[PDB]
Amino acid sequence: VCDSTIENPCIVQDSKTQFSPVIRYREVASIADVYGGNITGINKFHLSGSEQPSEKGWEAIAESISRKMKKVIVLDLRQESHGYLNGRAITLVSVYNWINLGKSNSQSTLDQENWLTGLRSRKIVNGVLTVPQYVAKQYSQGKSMVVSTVKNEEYYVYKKGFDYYRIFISDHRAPLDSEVDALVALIKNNPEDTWYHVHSRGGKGRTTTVFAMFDMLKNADKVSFEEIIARQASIPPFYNLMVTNREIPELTPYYEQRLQFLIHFYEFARQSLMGYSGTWSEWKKLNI
Amino acid sequence: VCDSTIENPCIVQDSKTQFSPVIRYREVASIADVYGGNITGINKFHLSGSEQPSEKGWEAIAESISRKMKKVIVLDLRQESHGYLNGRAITLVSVYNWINLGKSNSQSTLDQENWLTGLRSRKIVNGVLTVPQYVAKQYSQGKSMVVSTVKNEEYYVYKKGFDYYRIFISDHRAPLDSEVDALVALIKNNPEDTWYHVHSRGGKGRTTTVFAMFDMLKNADKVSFEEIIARQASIPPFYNLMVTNREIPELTPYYEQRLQFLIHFYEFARQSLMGYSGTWSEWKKLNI
Ligand SMILES: O=P(O)(O)O[C@H]1[C@H](OP(=O)(O)O)[C@@H](OP(=O)(O)O)[C@H](OP(=O)(O)O)[C@@H](OP(=O)(O)O)[C@H]1OP(=O)(O)O
Ligand SMILES: O=P(O)(O)O[C@H]1[C@H](OP(=O)(O)O)[C@@H](OP(=O)(O)O)[C@H](OP(=O)(O)O)[C@@H](OP(=O)(O)O)[C@H]1OP(=O)(O)O
């Protein structure tokens, strides 16, 4: 039985079933129809986001993207190990969902796939908790499930003809410099018409952070910091990156640091649109 | 001005810039995390591949290989003459990229280095075409570039501490018997832990062919022909050697012949794992 430590992490089932719908799907361009302030540079984005989809959720997302259309890149923002059991999204959860905190991206991927390979070799997976059970610390009341399939996200992304690219952001936290560099390079290294579907575990904090980063990279020289953050918060689920006191108070330092990073990324983006040609890591060394 | 004939071949720049990233890097071992069928004998391969890297691409490849680790052998599969101008990968292109077709490997190397030496003696190289320009037959719209450096691949491979070994495969075609012999001997003559980075021009046809050959040599006695080909097609760029009708229909005969060779190489590999001790050329004489 798990105990949410890194030594005995929990299998937590994020999808209620393999048919569960996507509840936090949205397209950034819709901000132009809801936000009452500066909407300059919004309505042309090829950018959607969501929480972690179920098997069926990927179908709905693919259909949504096709209706709004080039290349489609699914942007997985999750550092933590995750995958699918019988079409249901699952996560390997330690306290604050930081199972892979402090690891190289190579080790994070290795640990995830070693875990998924282990589950895949079993006929029965025990100790599968729902999110309510995990929150309630009912570590021994998990269910035993006959294994039909165990898959990583790539399996479902590849099946839709999309690319998969992972940015290893720790839950509740700002991206590390390596991952900022990687995101900026990805955007620069792909056509401007590329569609990105950004997702995290909950489609809230990390997803909205990256939405804001996209917005700044394109518009920081014609839209104020406050309006970029505000307009990103204007569409459901209305995630406001200005808020640093949230449901879990022990996480406030990380929300404050994440907003502080966004302040600096905004200036980096603005100066980049004005002539600066280096990377985020190079700019940060000279300016912070 | 060039005209894509062997008498006036074109200088074609494969790298957009000297900083262009590697877009088709993958490791064969990853098949074990994506392929839903027989994965026996995959997860221990020390095998990566890519398209022709830019100067900077070699750095990324070296870093990738170090993260997954003995000797490292860069396996250049390209018969055609190629090199680098100011850090950008370049190719001497005749129709269907067959500038060195029918030549001995010694002559191919000689012709390449005579060409590179000629470019290196110039302060300005004229007629440098991008791939789009070449495809569009805009032979006179090439750019003139001040020569900072002209290098062969060895220069960058040696700088990373890797070995360089060339297998002279014609673009779009199966390897000739001499080159099959050479590949099999190379694998046999080096430790089983040796890391191989296999690349062609596009990191598609020739690279995937050799991936399959590696797989067969180790696993043909426990994995079916169809599953070796299928599992090699399971990871990006999803090159499926079963497909013989591709973008260019005049090349279908060569794709069919390449698949036919793989059928025979599979049997050779299987019998070799079962006791046969001769070379491919010896086996082919007795069995085809
Ligand atoms: O998946 P959910 O059940 O909807 O939970 C989300 C998820 O975090 P957890 O799943 O670990 O609880 C969000 O993170 P992302 O995967 O989208 O990055 C997190 O975002 P932040 O901590 O950055 O805010 C958010 O937190 P919050 O509620 O404060 O918005 C939290 O939501 P819930 O606590 O309501 O489940
Ligand atoms: O380098 P690319 O622009 O990506 O082109 C590649 C490259 O051929 P060319 O560069 O000469 O066009 C592949 O060859 P390799 O160097 O990897 O051996 C070739 O492989 P095949 O002809 O064997 O299939 C492939 O062809 P295809 O598209 O049919 O996969 C083709 O791709 P593109 O035509 O899309 O450029």
DSSP symbols for A20-34:
PPPSS-EEGGGGGGT
Smallest CA-to-CA distance from A46 within A66, A60, A76, A24 is with A66
| Rounded Cα gap, residues B236 and B50, in angstroms | 10
Q: What are the residues whose beta carbons fall under 8 Å from the beta carbon of A205, sequence distance 6 or more?
A: A171, A172, A239, A258
The side-by-side arrangement of strands in the sheet containing A72-78 is A26-27, A47-50, A195-199, A72-78, A163-169
Strand, coil or helix: B266 = helix
Q: What is the residue whose two structure tokens read 């406050």?
A: A226
Phi, then psi, of B202 in degrees rounded to 5: -100, 0
Enter the tokens of residue A14. 């994020």
Is the dihedral angle over the CA atoms A181, A160, B198, B249 positive or is it negative? negative
**Residue given tokens 């075409």 in the structure block:** B129
Helix (H, G, I), strand (E, B) or coil at B273: helix
Within 10 A of A187 (CB to CB), how many other CB atoms are there? 17
Pair B245, B252: CB distance under 8 Å: yes
Q: Which residues of B touch A158 (CB under 8 A)?
A: 34, 236, 238
A152–B34 CB contact, under 8 Å? yes
Sole residue written with tokens 């890391």: B195
Q: Which of residues 43-72 of B touch A (CB under 8 A)?
A: 67-68
R_g over Cα of chain B: 19
Whole-Å CA distances, A163 to A149, B5, B45:
22, 37, 24
Q: How far apart (Å, rounded) are the C-alpha atoms in residues B28 and B45?
A: 7
Contacting residues of B for A104, CB less than 8 Å apart: 67
Spatial CA neighbour of A128 closest among A6, A17, A202, A248:
A17
Which residue in this structure is represented by tokens 């590999």?
B269
- For residue B93, the SS3 value is strand
Contact A213, A265 (CB under 8 A): yes
Tokens of A96: 């604050």
Query: Residue B24: how many CB atoms within 10 A of its CB?
Result: 18
| Distance between CA atoms of residues A71 and A73, nearest Å | 7
Give the ranges where chain A is alpha helix by DSSP (H): 55-67, 105-120, 131-135, 153-159, 177-188, 205-219, 225-232, 252-273, 280-287
CB pairs under 8 A between A and B: 20
Q: Using an 8 Å Cβ cutoff, are A205 and A261 in contact?
A: no
Q: How many CB atoms lie within 10 A of CB A225?
A: 18
Residue B154: phi, psi to the nearest 5? -50, -40
Q: Do A185 and B236 touch (CB under 8 A)?
A: no
* Nearest partner of A248 among A37, A98, A106, judged by Cα: A98
CB atoms within 10 A of CB A138: 12
Residue with tokens 């796939």: A113
Tokens of A13: 């089932």
Give the torsion sign (CA, B35, B39, B44, B46): negative
Contact between residue A85 and residue A119 where contact means Cβ atoms under 8 Å apart: yes
DSSP A163: E
Cβ neighbours around B258 below 10 Å, total: 20
Residue B21 Cα to ligand 2 midpoint, Å, equals 18
Q: What is the DSSP track for A42-108?
A: TTT--EEEES---HHHHHHHHHHHHHT---EEEEEEE-S-EEEETTEEEEEE-GGG-TTTT--HHHH
Which residues face A74 on adjacent strands?
A164, A197
Q: How far apart are CA B287 and CA A130, in angstroms?
A: 60
If phi over 0 gives left and psi between -120 and 50 gives alpha, with beta otherwise, what is residue B231?
A: alpha
Q: What are phi and psi of A135, to 5 degrees?
A: -60, -40
Neighbouring residues of B221: CB distance < 8 A, sequence distance ≥ 6: B269, B270, B273, B274
Using an 8 Å CB-CB cutoff, list chain A residues near B236: 158, 163
User: Is there an atom of ligand 2 within 6 Å of B203 CB?
Assistant: yes
Tell me if B250 CB under 6 Å of ligand 2: no
By DSSP bridging, strand A163-169 and strand A72-78 are parallel
- First-residue to last-residue Cα distance in chain A: 45
B96: its two tokens: 């269907």
Sheet holding A150-151, edge to edge: A143-146, A124-130, A10-13, A88-93, A82-85, A150-151
Data resolution in angstroms? 2.0
Per the CB < 8 Å rule, is B33 touching A116?
Answer: yes
Buried b (16+ CB within 10 A) or exposed e, B41-65: bbeebbbbbbbbbbbbbbbebbebb
Chain centroid, CA A14 distance in Å? 14
Domain ranges of chain A: 1-288
- Among chain B residues, the shortest Cα distance to A148 is held by B36
Q: Is the CB of A172 under 6 A from ligand 1?
A: yes
Span from the CA of A96 to the centroid of ligand 1 (angstroms): 10
Q: Testing the interface with B: which of A154, A156, A157, A188 to mutate, by most B Cβ within 10 A?
A: A154
Give the C-alpha separation, B270 to B280, whole Å: 12
From the number of C-beta atoms within 10 Å of its C-beta (0-12, 13-18, 19+), residue B28 rates as buried
Cα-based angle A235, A239, A241 (whole degrees, multiple of 5): 125
Cα–Cα nearest to B69, from B112, B118, B29: B29
